[PDB]
């Protein structure tokens, strides 16, 4: 049970957001090819779902968060059922009842990762991710990292923590000119072109 407070305690010491940043890795490898809004619909809920409990104890501790952890999992049921995606979490979608749950928490990572996306053209920035509706911010900064997550898993967060520091600074620039349209472009494109060479 212990295993529900560590993670209480731990949203509480780093927060909603970066407490994320975790499940999010936990998430995206443990079911890989499952798109990135999808991982976000729920991620995104459990980690903002520590707001909702923090302030009662061990005893209504666990009881508050049933409330969504039963209901999150009543909506996968039909909401899954619409996007007939993956297989070993899409096979046992649909159980006898009684059975739901132990087959999923029995069921380890996998990591079955078939396809890819090898689309470089695709993928923006444009000016309006900081221009149009600043809170849309949130999810925006953020699949960023995931993307490069998908394209080659396996980070070292070490290293990342000190980008973390120099991606504050891109970012301020980024809409804070004259003619930030074409820095998006030109200065976005540029880093691209660094990373493409190599990492190291
Ligand atoms: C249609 C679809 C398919 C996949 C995905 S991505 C997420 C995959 N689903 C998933 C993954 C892990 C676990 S788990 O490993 O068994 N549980 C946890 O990892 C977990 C982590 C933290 C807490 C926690 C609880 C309280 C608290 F205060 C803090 C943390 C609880 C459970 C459970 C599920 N699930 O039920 O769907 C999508 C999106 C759609």
Redesign the pocket.
């Known amino acids: 049970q212990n295993?529900?407070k560590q993670?209480?305690e731990?949203?509480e010491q780093l927060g909603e957001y970066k407490?994320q940043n975790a499940?999010l890795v936990?998430?995206?490898k443990?079911?890989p090819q499952?798109?990135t809004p999808?991982?976000?619909?729920?991620?995104r809920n459990?980690?903002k779902?520590?707001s909702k409990?923090?302030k009662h104890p061990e005893a209504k501790?666990?009881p508050c968060?049933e409330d969504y952890?039963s209901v999150?999992?009543n909506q996968?049921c039909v909401?899954?059922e619409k996007?007939p995606?993956?297989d070993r979490?899409?096979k046992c979608?649909t159980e006898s009842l009684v059975n739901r749950?132990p087959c999923?928490?029995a069921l380890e990572v996998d990591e079955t990762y078939v396809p890819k996306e090898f689309n470089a053209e695709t993928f923006t920035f444009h000016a309006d991710i900081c221009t149009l509706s600043e809170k849309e911010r949130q999810i925006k900064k953020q699949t960023a990292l995931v993307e490069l997550v998908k394209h080659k898993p396996k980070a070292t967060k070490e290293q990342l923590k000190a980008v973390m520091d120099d991606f504050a600074a891109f970012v301020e620039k980024c809409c804070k000119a004259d003619d930030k349209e074409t820095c998006f472009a030109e200065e976005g494109k540029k880093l691209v072109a660094a990373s493409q060479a190599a990492l190291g």
Do not use: D, P, Q
């Open positions: 295993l529900i993670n209480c731990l949203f407490f499940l936990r998430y995206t443990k079911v499952v798109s999808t991982l976000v619909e729920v991620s459990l980690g779902v520590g409990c923090c501790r666990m968060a952890l999150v999992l996968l909401l899954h996007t995606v993956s979490v899409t979608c749950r999923f928490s």
